[PDB]
Every structure is written in C-alpha cells, then in structure tokens.
C-alpha cells in the first residue's frame, strides 16, 4: 500500500527515517508485514549485542519494538525471536529481551520453541547463581511472567513440573546501588516466587518434595528493601494466596511459630499508608483459621495487636470492623481454656476495647451537629467521600451485635448456683462496665423499630450479669439516664424492658421508686417535657 512506498524509499539517519515511517504507518497489510519481517532480519543481523549504547543499536531495538507494537508470519518471527534471545541472555545485556519475551508472549497467544525457551530460562536461572556470586537479572523477571502466561495459554502437564524442579533449584541464598540492583534481582525473585505461589495454590498439587517453602518466604519478607512499594504488595499477596489453601497453612506453625508475622514487615512510610489494611487482613483470617497450636503468650499477642487497630482512627472504617469480628470468633479458644481467671482477665480487655471505641463514636456526634484535615495542601491519597451519619450507624449496629456474644461468654467464666448467673467482679472491673452502660446509652443519640432493636440488644446484655453487681451499675447511671431521657423519649423503652417480666423486676423497681421520690418535689415546678417524662 502507501506504507510500502514510503518505507522502500526510506530503506542514525535512515534508522530515524524508517522508524518514523513505521510509527506513522502503525498510526495509519500482511504483505507489508512480511516485507518488514525481511527488513527485521537485516536489522537484527547488524549488531545483535548491545553493551547499553546511546547509538542506533538501541534505535534498532526501537524499530524492532515498533514491529512488536504493530502486531510464515509467526514461524519466522518466533525463529528470529529465539535467535535474538539466544545470544546475550543470561547476562546483563539490554532490555531488548523484555521486548523479545513480550513478542514471544504475543506469538504464543495465537510449540517446540517454548520448550527451548523454558530450557533457556532454566539455564539462565542456573547461571543466575553464578552471576549472584559475581556480585557477592531483569530478564529473569520478564521470563518469569512470560513463561507462566504461555503455560496458562496452552498445555502444561509434564513440562510444568519439569521446570518446577528448575524453579525449586532457583535462587534462595544471598556499592549500595549495585547491592540494590542485586536486591532488584532479589525483587525479581519475589515476582518469580509469585509464579511459585500461583502454581502451589490454584487448582491442584505438584511435586511436593519441599519442606523449606516457608523458609523462602519469611526470610524474603525481612531482607526485602522497602524502596519499591509494589514489590511488597505482591509479596503480601503472595502470602495472601498461600495462606488460603489448607495443606500449606499447616507448615506455618513450624519455625515461624506465628511469631514473625507482625508489622515489622511494613517498614517504609510509602508502605505505612495503604499496605497496612492488607497486612492486617492476611493475619486476621489466618489466626481465625488455625485456632490451634497457640500458647497463651501468642493468644495475648494476638488479642493485643488486633484491638490497637480497632481504637485506631487512622486506618479505615471497614478494617476496624474486621478487627472487631476477629476478637469475637477468637472467644472459642479464650473461653474454652482453663478457669485460672485468664479466661476472665482476657475477656475484660476486649470489653474494654469495645468501650474505648464507643467513646470515640460519641466525640464526633456534636461535631456532626481536628476534623478539618482536607484544607491541608499536599493530599497524600484519594480523599474519603463517605458521609459520617450512615456508617456510624452501621458501625454501632455491628459492634452491638458482636458485643452480646462476648457477654454471653462472660456468663461461663465465673470464679469459684455458681458458674450460672453469679460472678465475682473486682472494683477495677466494674469501672469498665459503668463506661459500657454510659457509652451505649450515649451512642443512641445517633437516632422507630430500628433503634428499638438495639435497645433489646443493650438491655439483654445487662440482664444476665450478677444482680448483686447490677444494682450498682444501674444505680449510678440512673441520674445520667434521666438527663438523656428528656431530649430523647425513645430511651424510655430501656427501663420499660428492665422490669418487663424478668429476673431484675424485683430489684430495679425498688431502685427506680427510690429515685422518683426525690424528684417528686421537683415535679410541680418543671416545664412540660420534664413533667411528661416523670409521670411516664
């Protein structure tokens, strides 16, 4: 066509004349493709090696990538791509092998050369150990992705485990910029371990002759330099996928001992921003899924670090409710331990940790009726677009649901009709119940069957708890509840249920009738809404 007339006339100067004509023709068929394939064989013949130059050899790769960017078509192309990837492969040659592997990925998307390329990748991985001893590798990252893509595209039954033995024999041991470039090759190994992660947990098993498989991961979370943030994001997603299948999860209660899976892995501030809601969710479900092999030193270290995310208003919202649901489903190991009072002294930390989240919910209510950080110039992320009123109703609805199941587990943890309704509370422990009654009353200001449903969940938590120590909580919080009951008449349902045919009717009605005899003199003088409530 017209692209062949402009290029045959244009067949540093003529390389710029050919590449600009090819880029314009690509901006603009098969006969021009086969003619350019003959021109590509002449272009690849002259100076196939690079030695990283500022000369037309890089422009020769630019016109070759221009042929790759445009589109025996595939047979002569794959023979030329394997020939260019033959010379200068397992050394620091150029980035032309990345364009060659991308062209090989485009050719394989449409068979014996793939077995030769996998053999070329295995020897380059074998020669990677000698190159690592030389510095005692960017093509290894490109060959890791391309090989996996080709395997997914076609068939991989016997040669997949054959290269996996070469992948089992891959790199496992170990100036500042050259050490970081060697760490960039180690960063390529983490992307290469993602190919080891995707094969090990997708569908089926493989050659299971491997026992140091957790040792090649817990090491690599530690010595991974925190410069490249996406290198650790895929390495966290490497462990996110491996800790989902059951046969690989049991390897982790070995020499890790669930002890090196804390937040000394999220080092840099560039990883401190958004990699923490990922680095917390992989360890929240993993701790829930095991629920075994846990010494109570670990059970304290897991119940401490996962309520210092609940009381942290810098993470997110939906990762605060994930960190609350963990402590709910962790009660089946904490309650079912021995009655050494460690089943009670652990459950009161969690009830404290839900008390100190209802407190922060009540600070922002009058602010709805340091919250201005959007006027700050250098915004560091996408600003949140969610409102405050709907999700605070959503958080309080969910946290009251989780709270009743913990307080049922308080009923069984009684110290020596014992262990049924009666329990001994210390004075250090009744002070955190009085701030649970005070904040649950106060967080119903965010208001009717929807809020009257929570008043069932709030009162039923306080029925089954020790009516010698229930006459103390409701006595101190009755002058406080009457003050909230003036501006909100819906809170009148709470004392209505506390005496509605229950085990507290014989004691709450005597406490209430002592209270209202004091306000009997102050009935003739108040206005309507205080006198309406008082006769109710």
């Amino acid at each position: 066509v017209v692209q062949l007339d402009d290029f045959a006339t244009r067949l540093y100067q003529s390389k710029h004349s050919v590449l600009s004509e090819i880029c314009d023709s690509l901006e603009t068929y098969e006969y021009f493709l086969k003619s350019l394939i003959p021109l590509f064989i002449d272009v690849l013949k002259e100076v196939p090696v690079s030695f990283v130059a500022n000369s037309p050899e890089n422009k020769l790769r630019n016109i070759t990538l221009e042929i790759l960017h445009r589109i025996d078509a595939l047979q002569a192309y794959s023979n030329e791509i394997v020939d260019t990837l033959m010379d200068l492969l397992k050394v620091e040659n150029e980035l032309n092998g990345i364009l060659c592997m991308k062209a090989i990925t485009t050719l394989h998307k449409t068979q014996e050369k793939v077995h030769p390329f996998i053999d070329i990748v295995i020897e380059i991985y074998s020669n990677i150990p000698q190159v690592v001893e030389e510095q005692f590798s960017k093509q290894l990252a490109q060959a890791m992705f391309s090989f996996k893509t080709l395997a997914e595209s076609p068939i991989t039954m016997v040669s997949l485990y054959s290269s996996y033995k070469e992948l089992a024999a891959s790199s496992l041991g170990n100036n500042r910029a050259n050490y970081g470039e060697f760490i960039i090759g180690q960063v390529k190994a983490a992307s290469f371990l993602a190919y080891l992660f995707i094969r090990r947990q997708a569908q089926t098993f493989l050659e299971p002759y491997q026992q140091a498989i957790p040792d090649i991961i817990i090491r690599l979370l530690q010595d991974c330099p925190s410069e490249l943030s996406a290198a650790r994001k895929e390495l966290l997603h490497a462990t996110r996928h491996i800790l989902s299948t059951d046969f690989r999860k049991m390897f982790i209660p070995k020499i890790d001992l669930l002890f090196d899976l804390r937040v000394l892995i999220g080092e840099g501030f560039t990883a401190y921003e958004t990699l923490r809601p990922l680095a917390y969710s992989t360890v929240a479900d993993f701790i829930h899924n095991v629920r075994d092999h846990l010494t109570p030193a670990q059970l304290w270290k897991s119940v401490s670090i996962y309520c210092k995310n609940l009381q942290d208003d810098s993470l997110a919202l939906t990762v605060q409710i994930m960190s609350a649901k963990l402590l709910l489903n962790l009660i089946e190991k904490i309650m079912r331990s021995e009655s050494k009072t460690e089943s009670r002294q652990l459950l009161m930390v969690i009830i404290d940790a839900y008390t100190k989240r209802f407190k922060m919910l009540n600070s922002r209510y009058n602010g709805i009726m340091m919250s201005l950080q959007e006027y700050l110039p250098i915004q560091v992320s996408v600003p949140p677009e969610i409102d405050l009123l709907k999700d605070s109703r959503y958080l309080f609805k969910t946290l009251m649901t989780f709270l009743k199941t913990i307080m049922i587990g308080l009923k069984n943890s009684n110290p020596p009709n014992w262990n049924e309704t009666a329990r001994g509370f210390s004075n250090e422990d009744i002070n955190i119940l009085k701030s649970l009654f005070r904040e649950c009353i106060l967080a119903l200001r965010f208001f009717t069957k929807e809020e009257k449903d929570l008043m069932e969940i709030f009162a039923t938590m306080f029925i089954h708890i020790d009516p010698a120590s229930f006459n103390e909580i409701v006595r101190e919080e009755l002058p406080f509840m009457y003050k909230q009951m003036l501006d909100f008449a819906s809170l009148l349902h709470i004392p209505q249920f506390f005496l509605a045919s229950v085990i507290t009717s014989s004691s709450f009605s005597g406490i209430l009738i002592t209270f209202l005899k004091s306000k009997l003199v102050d009935l003739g003088e108040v206005n309507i809404i205080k006198s309406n409530i008082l006769i109710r």
Partner: protein, 342 residues
C-alpha cells in the same frame, strides 16, 4: 499559599530545601517534594520539573502526580508542548497526560492532530473505573471539538456511538453525541437489547437535528420487528413519526399496523402507544371502539383495587371521552362507577 509577602531571601533557598528532597528513595515523600515545588514555581530553569512529572510512573501516585501538574500548568505557558507530544510515542501512562489536556484547554488547541490520534487511542482505552475517565476523554473529544472548532471526527462519533452501544453518564454522552451530530448509522441500528433501543433513541435524535417519509417506510419495517422501555422507545419513535406526519398511504399502513398492535395488546403498552398515536393524529375512533371495551375491563380491574397503568388508562379514558363526543352510555356508567369507587 498564604504568605507570599513574608520575605524573599527565604524564597531563594526554598529550592535548597525542596529540590534537595527530590533525590529521596521512596515513592511518596519523593513525590511530595514535586507538589511543594509546584506552589513555589506558581508564584514567580522550570523545565526540569514538568518534564519529569508526566514521565513513566507506577499506579501508586495517581492522585499525587495529578495535583502537581494542575497547579503548575498556568505558569507553564507564562514561561513548547513537544515534551507532551514526545511521550505519546512511548496506555496507563497516558492518563496523567490526558488530565492536563482536560482541564486547562484554553491553549491546548494548537497541534490537535495528535489529539485526533489520542482520540483514536481514546477508543482503544475504552475497550472499569477508567471508563469514567474514558467518558471524560469522550467529553474531552467534545471539548477538543469545542477547542479546535474532518472525516475522522465522523469516525470518532462512530466509535462514540459504539461506546454508547457497548453500555447516567452515557445519557450525558448521548446528549453530547446529539450536540456533536448537529455540529451506516441506519445499518448499525439494523445490526443491533435495551442499548439497541437506546441506539434507536439516538437515531431519532440524529434524524431531528420527503426523505423522512421514505426513511419512515424503512423505519416501519424496523418498528414492526420491535412492536416499558420498549414503550418509552416507541414514545420517542412516535414523536419522530408524527413529526413527519405534521408536514401518504404508507402512513395509513403504519397506523393500521399499530392498530393491529393495539389489537394485539387487547397490553398496557398498546394503550401507551394509542395515547401517543392520538397525540398528533385526529382519526383513531375505529381502534377506540375495541379500546373502550378493553378500558371497560381495565376500569373493572381498577375499581376492584399497577397504579401507573391505571392512571394512564384513566388518561386514556380521558382522551377517549374527548374523542367520543356510540358507547357513551357504557362509558358514563363506568365513570360513575369510578366516581362511586374509592
């Protein structure tokens, strides 16, 4: 941003603080010195900042880079755009360039030939949350059409019609497609669910903003293969059909075929079609005779109690009562039964 009149000797070594923090190693406090140097350049050598702001970056600094360019561009023309054009020869790294040829386009209409190739790349990016950015790029093609003002512009509208056919924001894009057509389509409507009805909705919109009579004969074959959303599409179709009737024998056959479709309904869509038919045509009393029998069964079901259909049938009975003025006895009896109802 707040005190430019503080001093000027401290302005000399802002660069001794800010440009020193360009050479960091992370990806967030390295970028944060690109933004604090963009407030200082935008007050009063500035080539090396904005040639590296649009360079190849990862998807980590999406909101971080975009705020550093938008505060830099009004002083850039004060101090040309070959470096934005040079990076087009080398996808995901285009959207940073695209958003600075999106907002401050008072000077962007200089070399719009690459903008047409970017419009060709816009459809390639259209093939996700970036579809809203692609619709912004589709609005940018209307903006570049509003900035520059060929045959590729009609081809760009064809890709934009196919983008609307691939599908809110598209309704605003279809309104932008209607404004672009005013400033193969029948074969595209013959080739093509609800988007095909939306494609038929845009076809009548392109027909508005004789030859319309023979096209209505082709559209009568199109309406025969078609006759809620179909009622809404036919309501726009009858407005295009009655506009040509407002100014021959082909219009009598299309009225008889819809009356046969009204006989096929006798369900509520035919009453909606008859209301659009009686909206701009005088004589429909022959179909209104069996329609009064259908509305009598509709009023019997309405009196026994589809509130929108009964209100439309009451509007159909309101239109039929004005047309009837010999079933006036049965119509007034059902009206009194409706008056006696709740």
């Amino acid at each position: 941003k707040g005190a430019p009149t503080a001093l000027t000797d401290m302005r000399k070594d802002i660069i001794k603080f800010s440009w020193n923090y360009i050479k960091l190693d992370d990806n967030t406090s390295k970028q944060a010195a690109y933004v604090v140097t963009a407030y200082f350049i935008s007050r009063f050598l500035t080539t090396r900042i904005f040639v590296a702001l649009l360079r190849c970056h990862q998807i980590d600094t999406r909101y971080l880079v975009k705020q550093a360019l938008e505060l830099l561009a009004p002083v850039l023309s004060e101090r040309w755009l070959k470096w934005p054009r040079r990076v087009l020869s080398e996808t995901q790294v285009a959207n940073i360039y695209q958003l600075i040829v999106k907002f401050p386009d008072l000077f962007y209409p200089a070399r719009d030939h690459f903008i047409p190739n970017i419009i060709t790349a816009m459809g390639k990016l259209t093939v996700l949350e970036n579809q809203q950015l692609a619709i912004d790029l589709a609005e940018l093609i209307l903006k570049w059409e509003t900035k520059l003002p060929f045959a590729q512009r009609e081809a760009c509208v064809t890709f934009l019609i196919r983008y609307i056919c691939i599908s809110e924001l598209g309704k605003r894009a279809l309104n932008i497609l209607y404004e672009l057509l005013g400033p193969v389509k029948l074969q595209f409507f013959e080739r093509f669910l609800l988007g095909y009805c939306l494609n038929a909705l845009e076809v009548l919109a392109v027909a508005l903003k004789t030859w319309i009579i023979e096209n209505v004969s082709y559209l009568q074959k199109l309406l025969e293969k078609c006759l809620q959303d179909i009622q809404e599409i036919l309501q726009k179709v009858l407005g295009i059909i009655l506009e040509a009737i407002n100014k021959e024998d082909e219009p009598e056959e299309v009225t008889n075929f819809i009356s046969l479709i009204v006989n096929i309904i006798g369900v509520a869509a035919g009453v909606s079609l008859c209301w659009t038919l009686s909206l701009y045509r005088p004589n429909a009393l022959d179909s209104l005779l069996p329609s009064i029998m259908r509305t009598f069964n509709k009023l019997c079901r309405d009196h026994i109690a589809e509130f929108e259909a009964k209100v439309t049938t009451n509007l159909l009975e309101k239109i039929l009562n004005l047309c009837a003025a010999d079933q006036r006895r049965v119509f007034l009896s059902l009206l009194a039964q409706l008056i006696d109802r709740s």
